[PDB]
Amino acid sequence: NYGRGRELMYQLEKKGKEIKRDLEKILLSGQARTD
Amino acid sequence: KYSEEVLDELRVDLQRRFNYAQGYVDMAVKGYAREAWEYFYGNLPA
Amino acid sequence: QSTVAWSRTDWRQDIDADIGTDTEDIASMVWVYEHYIRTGVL
Amino acid sequence: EYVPSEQIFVDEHATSFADAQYFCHRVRRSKEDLVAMGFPKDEIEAFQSTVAWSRTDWRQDIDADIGTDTEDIASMVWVYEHYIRTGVL
Amino acid sequence: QGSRKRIFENTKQFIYEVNSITDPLGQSYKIIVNRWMPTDAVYFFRSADWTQMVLRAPKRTELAKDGSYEKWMIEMEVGLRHRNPYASGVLFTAAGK
Amino acid sequence: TLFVSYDQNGKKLSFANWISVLSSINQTIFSWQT
Prior knowledge:
part of a larger assembly, 6 chains, A: 35 residues, mainly alpha, 1 helix, B: 46 residues
């Protein structure tokens, strides 16, 4: 690689933290079980 | 004479390393260990 | 996950609950991170 | 130390280590040992054998990042070791 | 109203914070600040009464392979339960206009 | 002739990744009694 290399794990950790924050926010938020 | 910037860099590196290690180990071991424990008591077959 | 796998090894325990320890009590158990790393931090 | 067969490369005309003319063995060594022998001013020399290994099981992925910083001297790097019978002279 | 106020006896320290309440019944109340909440809502609950029921950890996984066009998937699945509905209180702001 | 040898600057360095950080049931349905 030219610039950094090994971007996959970086992106994966980023997405993991993103889904963690999203879960926290949506769980502390109110929404019905519309089905 | 440990600098605080050194400790911050170490914290960042260790955090990313732990993130990668967790992302791996989870699907590597625990995804199987959970169902294995469930089969231990026969609770997985519903 | 570390709590799920443990609370599923059995179906009785729940590590993320309160057994009665006050949060201010010095003996209150807390999660700490221990690490062994081979690296040239220097 | 043990050595898998996925990190070995040999010629076809050979039948044993004795008559072997060429024998390669990729290794994963830190940057420390390399600095001990070359390029002291430069330590940023970054980069089937992985497929067969990651398929011996279904948990490991040798081409991933376990958390080691690329600049960290202990960062493991792939080096090529070779034994060759030849008159390079 | 002249019923409660602060006092500084030559103190070089301004502390405009309060994170603990005690009602006339004696039930204390800790306070925590979470940015992941909606603006117009406050939740009165307990840590043990609520639990996060998880189904599968992230479980790093792959979808398929078309060559160099790699992909990856996650299988996060959880669920929320409450011991008693009428045990955690909430109050909003309404009746405007 | 004319040897200065002050402008090598053959660094050829790569990036360093100095980014910033800001960081079980079996069935699909579960029930409880109250």
